Amino acid sequence: APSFPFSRASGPEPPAEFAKLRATNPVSQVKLFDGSLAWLVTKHKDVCFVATSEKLSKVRTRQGFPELSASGKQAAKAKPTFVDMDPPEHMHQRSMVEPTFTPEAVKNLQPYIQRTVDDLLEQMKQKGCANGPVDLVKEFALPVPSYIIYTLLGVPFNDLEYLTQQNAIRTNGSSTAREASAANQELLDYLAILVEQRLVEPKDDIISKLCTEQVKPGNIDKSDAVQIAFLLLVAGNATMVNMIALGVATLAQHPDQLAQLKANPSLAPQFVEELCRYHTASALAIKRTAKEDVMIGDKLVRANEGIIASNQSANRDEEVFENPDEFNMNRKWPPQDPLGFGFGDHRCIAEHLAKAELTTVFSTLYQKFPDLKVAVPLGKINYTPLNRDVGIVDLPVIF
Ligand code: HEM
Numbered sequence: 001a002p003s004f005p006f007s008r009a010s011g012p013e014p015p016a017e018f019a020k021l022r023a024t025n026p027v028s029q030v031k032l033f034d035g036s037l038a039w040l041v042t043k044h045k046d047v048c049f050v051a052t053s054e055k056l057s058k059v060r061t062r063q064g065f066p067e068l069s070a071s072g073k074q075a076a077k078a079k080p081t082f083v084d085m086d087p088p089e090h091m092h093q094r095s096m097v098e099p100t101f102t103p104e105a106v107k108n109l110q111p112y113i114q115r116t117v118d119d120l121l122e123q124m125k126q127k128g129c130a131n132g133p134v135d136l137v138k139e140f141a142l143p144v145p146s147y148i149i150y151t152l153l154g155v156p157f158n159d160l161e162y163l164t165q166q167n168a169i170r171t172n173g174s175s176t177a178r179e180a181s182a183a184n185q186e187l188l189d190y191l192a193i194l195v196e197q198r199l200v201e202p203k204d205d206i207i208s209k210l211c212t213e214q215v216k217p218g219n220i221d222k223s224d225a226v227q228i229a230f231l232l233l234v235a236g237n238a239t240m241v242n243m244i245a246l247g248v249a250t251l252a253q254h255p256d257q258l259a260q261l262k263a264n265p266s267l268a269p270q271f272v273e274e275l276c277r278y279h280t281a282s283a284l285a286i287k288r289t290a291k292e293d294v295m296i297g298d299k300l301v302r303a304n305e306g307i308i309a310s311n312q313s314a315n316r317d318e319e320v321f322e323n324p325d326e327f328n329m330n331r332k333w334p335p336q337d338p339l340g341f342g343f344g345d346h347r348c349i350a351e352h353l354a355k356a357e358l359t360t361v362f363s364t365l366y367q368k369f370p371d372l373k374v375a376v377p378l379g380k381i382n383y384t385p386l387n388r389d390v391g392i393v394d395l396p397v398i399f
Pocket of ligand 1: 082083094231233240285340344345347
């Protein structure tokens with residue numbers, strides 16, 4: 001059994017194993033870091049089944065849960081938030097924060113999303129690139145999702161830049177373990193203080209809603225509120241940064257489609273849909289253990305055996321998406337959903353927010369900077385390490 005996670009075939013490409021497995025062995029066994037074996041599911045239809053089957057559990061203290069590293073194994077010891085819950089606990093806690101992320105609520109946020117993107121682009125213009133390329137990640141891709149989610153949680157404007165840097169340190173590939181865990185503690189300590197404050201005078205933010213509607217009535221206590229707030233910050237931020245940067249790089253690689261976006265900014269939604277299918281930047285989140293024996297394709301998965309469902313592979317499934325390895329913002333979409341945000345009850349709570357952010361970025365960026373160019377040869381883009389989710393570490397641009 002091959003070791004899993006697989007390595008990406010190159011900087012921007014999924015692992016090569018997935019296409020071979022989809023063709024010849026779509027439910028197969030892989031070997032995890034600790035020697036245990038898990039089942040790997042690669043076809044779109046089977047990923048949807050794993051994501052919705054009531055016979056499968058996300059509870060991480062069940063025998064067989066497929067942790068992919070040693071830190072995940074010890075993270076499993078902490079009190080769980082709704083990301084690691086089964087029904088009915090899952091929606092009980094998830095519904096406490098879902099009102100901010102509904103399509104209606106995200107529509108109302110759209111002026112603020114646009115103002116945030118406008119302000120950060122205007123700052124980048126004023127900085128200019130007269131002394132060399134600037135890093136689109138540090139200058140734009142990182143602060144846009146960071147400022148928005150921090151602001152929604154309730155962080156005041158003056159604290160945004162420090163906390164944005166600290167959260168970046170958490171996931172930066174060249175951080176030492178001491179740097180990353182110190183940045184992590186910095187974030188937890190700040191959120192605990194913000195929770196204490198909102199308990200005394202609530203404002204109009206997510207932490208205030210939790211303190212007022214759940215902590216004070218006793219449905220959760222203030223430490224749960226910290227954990228839930230922390231989850232909403234760290235679950236998707238690094239992914240948002242990577243999606244923005246991957247979108248720019250992808251458009252640099254497909255000049256004809258960038259030309260269409262420049263001439264019709266209203267194509268941004270379709271560009272975003274294809275971006276999230278093609279670059280599945282969160283590919284290791286759909287993991288389960290079997291509560292009972294369950295049949296998947298031609299394989300029997302026994303109780304207490306772990307399953308990993310690759311939405312990355314599913315988003316390249318030849319049986320669902322015609323020419324899946326071509327980036328084509330003008331593709332015709334089948335009835336099946338792309339799985340960039342997962343599927344079923346656990347499907348990304350922030351799907352609408354994430355897409356609204358991505359759509360605002362790509363309908364604005366080239367209107368502001370019509371000559372935005374990646375400043376290094378495209379073959380020299382600094383992608384994330386091949387053993388990690390696809391992403392871009394830094395992206396020098398001129399404009
Ligand atoms: C483009 C950016 C994003 C992508 C591609 C993405 C992708 C995903 C994926 C694949 C999952 C697993 C869903 C499943 O189990 O079926 C997920 C879950 C989640 N995401 Fe996102 N996400 C993004 C942005 C965000 C943001 C901005 C936030 C927070 C504000 C967020 C919070 C979450 C949470 C809390 C979960 C767990 C939901 C649950 O188990 O009920 N994500 N996301």
